[PDB]
Chains A and B, each alone.
Chain A
Amino acid sequence: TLILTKNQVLHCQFSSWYSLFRKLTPKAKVIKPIPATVLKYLHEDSIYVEQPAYYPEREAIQLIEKAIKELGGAVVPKLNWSTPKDALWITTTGSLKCTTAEEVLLLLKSSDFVAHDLNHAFDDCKDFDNADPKDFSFELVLKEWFPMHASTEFRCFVKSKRLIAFCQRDDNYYEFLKENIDCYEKLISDLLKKLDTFPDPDFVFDVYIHKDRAWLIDINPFYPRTDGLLFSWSELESMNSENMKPEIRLIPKASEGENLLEFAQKWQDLTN
């Protein structure tokens, strides 16, 4: 029966793994520890904007803005773990893109995922007692924004340093995936080779494939708290961590050539 530990959460902290795999993950800036004024404001209830009510100090908004323009004007904000993917409705263009410090705050303040990071980070830890969390400090992660096609994003599962399974992150059908799926399987398997320096033998890494390059996006624990997507967690448990080939799951949906290419394989069944 699989369990979550204090250090499994600690290692998944953006700073904790970015440091290790900088060359493997797209450009970001980490403000650690998070400015007290920004944290203070973050904990206040309701979303107050300056455009008797607390708003972060001029020093903080200048520092966030300094990071933004240094990352080419547009960014994607995060705390130690969760991205505000749930709060796209508050955003001005329906994406995690942030050109201003206000846009950043608006996203972080209205996100339930960000809120989980703030008061539910160790809600399943056997090693920790949620009473008030060691040499730990919250961080504001600012990742350089880019047009990311949600089709070529994959969630990859790892048990005892072996690639167990991987699946599509989106929930739409893409016909062009089954065409390159063998090449992605190579790309993602070859990236895990470079994730050997990671401290946990069981983890879940998010990846983004663009121009024959499998980009690391995040790392989350091998625990049901982290969404198993197209795979069930009982399915992921009931899986060989010593089997040479991993299970792939894509979203489900002609020529004489196609038809009889299929025959050739249907003939190959009768044989072996």
Chain B
Amino acid sequence: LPNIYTDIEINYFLLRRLLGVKTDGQKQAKVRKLEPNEVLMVNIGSTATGARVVAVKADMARLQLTSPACTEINEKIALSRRIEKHWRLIGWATIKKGTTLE
């Protein structure tokens, strides 16, 4: 069931701290609550698109993409955030609902 989605509703989960092991032995920065009106980078298959966070409930959030993406419902997604001028992986998700262009 593949379609061209403009906005997607995702079931997500975040990492507690960023990936990596600091040489001084200090803990990696704690990944913060995904806030609305933040533009993340979403990896929806081959597609690397930007997505604006319009709302958050708990383990659910609605995202308004920057340009339309080709996916199916229940596709696995990778959430990323601009941290110290790097696209750092913050968490993952599954598309549960999505609004098409047509």
A residues near B (Cβ < 8 Å) are 45-51, 53, 89-94, 106, 109-110, 112, 115, 118-119
The 9 closest A-B pairs by CB, nearest first: A115-B85, A47-B39, A90-B50, A89-B48, A45-B83, A46-B82, A49-B37, A92-B67, A46-B38
Chain A residues, Cβ within 8 Å of B83: 45-46
Minimum Cβ distance to chain B for residue A196 (Å): 37
Query: CB of B61 within 8 A of chain A?
Result: no
Chain B neighbourhood of A89, CB < 8 A: 41, 48-50, 66
From DSSP, what is the main secondary structure of chain A's interface residues?
loop
Taking a contact as CB atoms under 8 Å apart, the answer to whether A49 and B39 are in contact is yes
List B contacts of A93 (CB < 8 A). Answer: 67
Chain A residues near B39 (CB-CB < 8 A)? 46-49, 90, 106, 109-110
Chain A residues near B86 (CB, 8 Å)?
A: 112
Residues 31-88 of B contacting A (Cβ, < 8 Å): 35, 37-41, 48-50, 52, 66-67, 81-87
Q: Taking the nearest CB of chain B, how far is it from the CB of A119, in angstroms?
A: 7
Instruction: Give A91 to B85 CA distance when docked, in angstroms.
Output: 18
Q: Which of B35, B40, B67, B84 contacts A45 (CB under 8 A)?
A: B84
Q: How far is the CA of A53 from the CA of B86 in the complex (A)?
A: 19
**Chain B residues in 8 Å Cβ range of A46:** 38-39, 81-83
- Which B residues lie within 8 Å of A90 (CB)? 39, 41, 49-50, 66
Cβ–Cβ < 8 Å partners of A110 in chain B: 39, 41, 50, 82, 87
Q: How far is the CA of A89 from the CA of B65 in the complex (A)?
A: 11
Contact (Cβ within 8 A) A45 B50: no
Are the CB atoms of A53 and B67 closer together than 8 Å? no
**Given pairs A90-B49, A110-B50, 14 additional interface contacts (CB within 8 A):** A45-B82, A45-B83, A46-B81, A48-B38, A49-B37, A51-B37, A53-B37, A53-B38, A91-B67, A92-B67, A94-B67, A110-B39, A115-B85, A119-B85
Smallest distance from the beta carbon of B42 to chain A beta carbons, Å?
Answer: 10
Whether B37 and A106, one on each chain, are in contact in the complex, defined by CB atoms closer than 8 angstroms, is no
Measured CB to CB, the closest approach of chain B to A123, in angstroms, equals 13
A-side contacts of B66, CB under 8 Å: 89-92, 106
B12 nearest CB across to chain A (Å)? 16
Q: Residue of B at shortest CB range from A42?
A: B85
Contacts of B49 in A (CB 8 A): 89-90
Complex-state Cα separation, A112 to B81, whole angstroms = 13
Q: List 28 A-B contacts (CB under 8 A).
A: A45-B81, A45-B82, A45-B84, A46-B81, A47-B39, A47-B50, A47-B82, A48-B38, A49-B38, A49-B39, A51-B52, A53-B37, A89-B41, A89-B66, A90-B39, A90-B41, A90-B66, A91-B67, A92-B66, A94-B67, A106-B50, A106-B66, A110-B39, A110-B50, A110-B82, A112-B85, A115-B85, A118-B85
Shortest CB-to-CB span from B99 to chain A, Å, is 17
Residue in A closest to B48 when the chains form the complex, CB atoms: A89
Smallest Cβ distance from A164 to chain B, in angstroms?
34
Which residues does chain A contribute within 8 Å of B67, judged by CB atoms? 91-94
Bound together, the chains give a CA A62 to CA B49 distance in angstroms of 27
- For B42, give the chain A residue with the smallest CB separation: A89
Give the complex CA separation of A45 and B49 in angstroms.
18
* Nearest CB in chain A: distance from B67 CB, A: 5
Q: Does the CB pair A47–B85 fall under 8 Å?
A: no
User: Nearest-CB distance from B101 to chain A (Å)?
Assistant: 13
Closest CB in chain A relative to B31 CB, distance in Å: 12
Chain B nearest Cβ from A114, distance in angstroms: 9
